[PDB]
Amino acid sequence: AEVTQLSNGIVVATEHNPAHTASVGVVFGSGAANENPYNNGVSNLWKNIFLSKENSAVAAKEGLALSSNISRDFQSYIVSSLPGSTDKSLDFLNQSFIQQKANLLSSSNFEATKKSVLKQVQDFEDNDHPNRVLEHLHSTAFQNTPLSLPTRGTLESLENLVVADLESFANNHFLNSNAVVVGTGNIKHEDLVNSIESKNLSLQTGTKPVLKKKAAFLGSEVRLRDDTLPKAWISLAVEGEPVNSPNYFVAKLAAQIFGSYNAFEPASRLQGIKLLDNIQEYQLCDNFNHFSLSYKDSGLWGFSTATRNVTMIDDLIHFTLKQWNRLTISVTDTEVERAKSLLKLQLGQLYESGNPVNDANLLGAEVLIKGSKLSLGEAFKKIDAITVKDVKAWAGKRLWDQDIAIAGTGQIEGLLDYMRIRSDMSMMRW
Template identity: 25%
Template sequence: MPVDLSFDDPRSDEVLDAAAGVRRSILPGGVRLVTQTDRSVRSATLGMWLPVGSRDERPEHAGSTHVLEHLLFKGTARRSAMDIATAFDEVGGESNAVTAKEHTLYYGRVRSADLPMALDVLTDMITAPSLEEDALATEREVILEELAMAEDDPGDVGYETFLADVLGPDTPIGRPVGGTAESVNALGIEDVRAHFSEHYRPENLLVTAVGDVDHEQLSEQLVAGLRRGGWVLEDGAVPTVRRREAHPEMMLGGAAGGHEVAAIRPHLLARPAEQTHIYLGGTGLSAVHEDRHALSVLMSILGGGMSSRLFQNIREQRGLAYTVYSFSAAYRDAGLFGLYAACRPARTAQVVELLGEELATMGERGVDQAEMRRARGQITGSFALGLEDTSSRMGRLGTVELVHGTYTGVDETLSRIAAVEAEDVRRLAAQLASSFSTRVDVGPES
């Protein structure tokens, strides 16, 4: 049965799933720790999550979340940048970080014997970074190169533009995660320090660990590491309340949708290229929407693999594109769906028409049981294969805690996918087909 991940008891310590070895504690300072013990492996993946992403930045701090992520690897009071880099390299481990729209994640994967080292390094980074002016000057250039690299990739620039157009380019959630060259150049070290002080606090921190780990031992080491970095961990403190719904107008069926595909004027990003990269779609489902499992099935049938409708119709039968698929993105209070294809410019109009028609047909005529069976098998299989990886399981625990607020076991999740009916998929397809609002083309001018 699902378990509510509440904050009511500041001393909360409970087993969420005894069979899977999942346990959760709220530690001093409101720090959350969720672990999954798996003695069949000799490694562990450790993640440190802060529920702050690009959408949480103040206008004057635009881009600071991503810049801060980079700077945390540039040294602390106890370690140089080289010390941080070599700590994982010399034990054959790996470490990295991800900035997203709604969270920032720092993680490491090591042998279980090296977990204390990984915990010490990561807690040092998030509690006591140096945040020096010269480090910002250097890393700013690195980030500008990163942005330039993305600008040269038609897939990256097309997707980011599509996402901004659907969610609103002038809204916090619609802004690019990495900022822009202008906003990154405008950031000063005091902006970054202010962003760090505001968000990197005990009550915001979630730590997840999966593998050959001991929950009690990790709890003690975590508290000690955070205190060593200078954080004050008060007994009785509770975690920050989870993100609330703030943009109901961005939900499926909101004001943004309702256009015929043929009437959507493309946002053309002119690039010298041999193909036109097409992004077509609109508002979708939030990460907590009750139809999210039906959306997974729909996306699998529509454009999730070689047997999908888009692949079979546009590539296999007509030979109009090499790459074609469907996709979705979900946030706490917003979501989007999209269809993608890359083709020679002369075929763009035909491909756009076929993309829209395929989803509309699904909404009108539904799907058959063979498609439902394949979709369930694809989702179940990829989900099961992902659980073989401690990093994937670590990420799942983080998403469950930060976004959903309810722990659901693997068997329960799979049963919910199995419970999706063909009519659920048809109904959702009809809704999506009526919500087309945005088209982005990246390629040569006609």
């Protein structure tokens, strides 16, 4: 458990633990939330040439493995080494992001990569209905606002993208003040920071990105009815918490109370979740899962679900929203306590997997926003300190009689109108 971050000319962040391999990468503070409607998908395209057969063979000769991830707030390019080769990873990083960042964009490479992210993003829209729905949830929830842009980009902005768009983006966002270099694995801080302060040369230092306009939640829906699909997939959310919200953890705990479910897993049917008494009688769904998604400016708190019970979708939604009503008025001590324990377990399994590439992404994203990483033991202190009173005060502000955002696809004829769903965000009282 370590967090050593220090700024030379660039900002260097590491977290070392004797494991096996080491992962080095640069993580930029700009993602799909920084694109336009019209160059949407430029980051995903950058990712895909960085992993192209040409660049990927040059790394595999050296015994290096490549990894990249496009998100909303950020963007990361990562090389995993075998831990004494922690220097030959920094060679491949700079040989790409200074030298080859004019050789990767060759006409034959770009056209074969663009053709591959087109088959890629098309395949997504055709078949991945849960993530497709969740992506459209962000699209309508945050419409005409940076968080609405999908991470993979749209088929139409993608096929109209040229080399100059990659260039213009790279020249405005792959800057020094919008970068953090991250090392996870087992390698020391002073083992890496010296290999970085070895070579100087700043490259476009002093240049800031471009500013924008703030993200906002708009209560709304997008309904992607398709009667030929064998199920209905729906996601429903309120405006949640940004990272570095006081209620960052209260929100995450609230989502753990209702948790996630899988009708076919015997153990899942037995969880201490009151909602399960309602939904199992007539089998109202195959699965659901609650989430508290947090970004820089905003977040989404809600749930997603999939079902073949297409004539009782209204009972699914009704029982789920009646449970959420309880958070404001009647959530019990032992529900909160169950959530604490399970939130710790899952937050643990995230922050300490046996895979440094995940560690890098979690470290990178955190330090880009607040300039530091809160340690796992520090989180548990915050989690344990949450009372029933906290959850109630949170839910009464975020959940009770608040606008929602809805998205769905498949057989959603039985998903009732907006106002019916929205009325269930509260209860009648004297």
